[PDB]
Amino acid sequence: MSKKLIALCACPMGLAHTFMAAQALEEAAVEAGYEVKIETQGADGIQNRLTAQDIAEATIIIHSVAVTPEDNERFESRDVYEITLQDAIKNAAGIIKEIEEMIASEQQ
């Protein structure tokens, strides 16, 4: 069926840096076929806010962060792949497809 991916980009610099990580992880997850919803936390504010439903649907989560995100508690109970916000930009596609083949391998 239609699987789901979410992410959280949180930067000490602010939302501009989180949007580079957001755009990157988004493209990657779109090529993976499923849904993608990425919340962005920074000193400027929070954009593209995830819902309790988004985090529940999420077969995959990526906390692409450099600081502890204020909303990390919502994902405490859930399966999160917590990396650096920089890895989200340089390795965007690599991250998503690696989580895909790790989960798929144990789901076979």
CATH assignment of the domain containing 81: 3.40.50.2300
DSSP labels, 17-73: HHHHHHHHHHHHHHHTSSEEEEEEEETTEEES---HHHHHH-SEEEEEESS--TTGG
Active site residue 9: no
- Residue 87: domain span: 1-108
Distance CA(83)–CA(52), nearest Å, equals 21
C-alpha span between 105 and 108 (Å, rounded): 6
CA 55/CA 80 separation, integer angstroms: 10
CB 53 within 8 A of CB 47: no
Cα 31 from Cα 34, distance rounded (Å): 8
Cβ pair 12, 43 in contact under 8 A: yes
Instruction: Say how many domains are in the chain.
Output: 1
Catalytic one of 11, 36, 50, 58:
11
Are the C-beta atoms of 10 and 42 separated by less than 8 Å?
yes
List Cα–Cα distances, 96 to 13, 15, 63, 69, in angstroms. 24, 22, 12, 20
